[PDB]
Protein backbone atom coordinates (compact mmCIF):
# COMPACT_ATOMS: atom_id res chain seq x y z
CA UNK A 1 0.00 0.00 0.00
CA UNK A 2 2.81 2.40 0.88
CA UNK A 3 4.67 1.44 -2.31
CA UNK A 4 1.68 2.18 -4.55
CA UNK A 5 0.88 5.38 -2.64
CA UNK A 6 4.43 6.66 -3.13
CA UNK A 7 4.38 5.84 -6.85
CA UNK A 8 1.01 7.62 -7.07
CA UNK A 9 2.41 10.72 -5.40
CA UNK A 10 5.51 10.76 -7.61
CA UNK A 11 3.30 10.51 -10.68
CA UNK A 12 1.14 13.31 -9.23
CA UNK A 13 3.80 15.95 -8.76
CA UNK A 14 5.58 14.94 -11.98
CA UNK A 15 2.31 15.70 -13.77
CA UNK A 16 2.15 19.01 -11.88
CA UNK A 17 5.68 19.89 -13.03
CA UNK A 18 4.83 19.13 -16.67
CA UNK A 19 1.67 21.25 -16.35
CA UNK A 20 3.78 24.18 -15.16
CA UNK A 21 6.13 23.60 -18.11
CA UNK A 22 3.43 23.68 -20.78
CA UNK A 23 1.70 26.67 -19.17
CA UNK A 24 5.00 28.56 -19.33
CA UNK A 25 5.43 27.61 -22.99
CA UNK A 26 1.92 28.90 -23.79
CA UNK A 27 2.59 32.09 -21.84
CA UNK A 28 5.76 32.58 -23.90
CA UNK A 29 4.21 31.88 -27.32
CA UNK A 30 1.43 34.50 -26.74
CA UNK A 31 3.81 37.38 -27.53
CA UNK A 32 4.97 35.99 -30.87
CA UNK A 33 1.29 35.42 -31.72
CA UNK A 34 0.52 39.10 -31.14
CA UNK A 35 3.61 40.30 -33.04
CA UNK A 36 2.74 38.07 -36.00
CA UNK A 37 -0.76 39.59 -35.93
CA UNK A 38 0.80 43.08 -36.02
CA UNK A 39 2.89 42.26 -39.08
CA UNK A 40 -0.15 40.69 -40.76
CA UNK A 41 -1.90 44.04 -40.16
CA UNK A 42 0.93 45.96 -41.83
CA UNK A 43 0.94 43.41 -44.67
CA UNK A 44 -2.77 44.16 -45.18
CA UNK A 45 -2.05 47.92 -45.30
CA UNK A 46 0.60 47.52 -48.00
CA UNK A 47 -1.71 45.04 -49.79
CA UNK A 48 -4.44 47.69 -50.05
CA UNK B 1 66.05 -2.45 23.30
CA UNK B 2 65.19 -0.85 26.61
CA UNK B 3 67.23 -1.16 29.79
CA UNK B 4 63.98 -0.98 31.78
CA UNK B 5 62.85 -4.30 30.26
CA UNK B 6 60.69 -6.03 32.90
CA UNK B 7 61.46 -9.72 33.34
CA UNK B 8 59.02 -11.97 35.22
CA UNK B 9 57.48 -15.09 33.67
CA UNK B 10 54.41 -15.56 35.84
CA UNK B 11 50.68 -15.23 35.29
CA UNK B 12 49.51 -11.88 36.66
CA UNK B 13 46.64 -12.24 39.10
CA UNK B 14 43.31 -10.82 37.96
CA UNK B 15 42.38 -7.41 39.34
CA UNK B 16 39.02 -6.30 37.94
CA UNK B 17 36.24 -8.23 36.21
CA UNK B 18 34.77 -7.30 32.84
CA UNK B 19 31.29 -5.76 33.17
CA UNK B 20 28.88 -3.80 31.02
CA UNK B 21 30.31 -0.32 30.31
CA UNK B 22 28.60 2.43 32.30
CA UNK B 23 27.77 4.76 29.44
CA UNK B 24 24.32 5.78 28.27
CA UNK B 25 24.99 7.74 25.07
CA UNK B 26 25.96 6.39 21.63
CA UNK B 27 25.94 2.72 21.49
CA UNK B 28 22.40 3.70 20.58
CA UNK B 29 20.98 5.19 17.39
CA UNK B 30 19.13 8.35 16.35
CA UNK B 31 15.37 8.20 16.00
CA UNK B 32 13.62 9.21 12.80
CA UNK B 33 9.95 9.93 12.23
CA UNK B 34 8.40 9.83 8.76
CA UNK B 35 5.24 8.70 7.02
CA UNK B 36 3.82 9.19 3.54
CA UNK B 37 0.37 9.84 5.03
CA UNK B 38 1.36 13.46 5.52
CA UNK B 39 1.53 13.79 1.73
CA UNK B 40 -2.26 13.41 1.47
CA UNK B 41 -2.87 17.09 2.21
CA UNK B 42 -2.47 19.28 -0.88
CA UNK B 43 -3.85 22.55 -2.23
CA UNK B 44 -6.87 23.15 -4.46
CA UNK B 45 -5.70 24.96 -7.60
CA UNK B 46 -8.42 27.59 -7.73
CA UNK B 47 -7.31 30.89 -9.27
CA UNK B 48 -5.64 29.75 -12.48
From Swiss-Prot, chain A:
Subcellular location: Nucleus
Domain of life: Eukaryota
Function: Required for activity of HDA1 histone deacetylase complex. The HDA1 histone deacetylase complex is responsible for the deacetylation of lysine residues on the N-terminal part of the core histones (H2A, H2B, H3 and H4). Histone deacetylation gives a tag for epigenetic repression and plays an important role in transcriptional regulation, cell cycle progression and developmental events.
Family, similarity comment: Belongs to the HDA2/3 family. HDA2 subfamily.
Subunit structure as annotated in this protein's UniProt entry: Heterodimer with HDA3. Component of the HDA1 histone deacetylase complex composed of at least one HDA1 homodimer and one HDA2/HDA3 heterodimer. Interacts with HDA1 and HDA3.
Additional remark text: Present with 1500 molecules/cell in log phase SD medium.
Protein's recorded name: HDA1 complex subunit 2
Naturally occurring in which organism (per UniProt): Saccharomyces cerevisiae (strain ATCC 204508 / S288c) (Baker's yeast)
Origin organism lineage: Eukaryota, Fungi, Dikarya, Ascomycota, Saccharomycotina
Protein's gene: HDA2
From Swiss-Prot, chain B:
Coiled coil: none
Subcellular location: Nucleus
Extra remark beyond the main annotation: Present with 3050 molecules/cell in log phase SD medium.
Its biological purpose: Responsible for the deacetylation of lysine residues on the N-terminal part of the core histones (H2A, H2B, H3 and H4). Histone deacetylation gives a tag for epigenetic repression and plays an important role in transcriptional regulation, cell cycle progression and developmental events. Histone deacetylases act via the formation of large multiprotein complexes.
Family of this protein: Belongs to the histone deacetylase family. HD type 2 subfamily.
The protein's name in its UniProt record: Histone deacetylase HDA1
Gene assigned in the entry: HDA1
Whole sequence portion shown: 29 to 76 of 706
Amino acid sequence: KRLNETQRQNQLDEIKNSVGLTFKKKQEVEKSINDSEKRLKHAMTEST
Amino acid sequence: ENSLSTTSKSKRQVIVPVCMPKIHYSPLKTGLCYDVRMRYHAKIFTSY
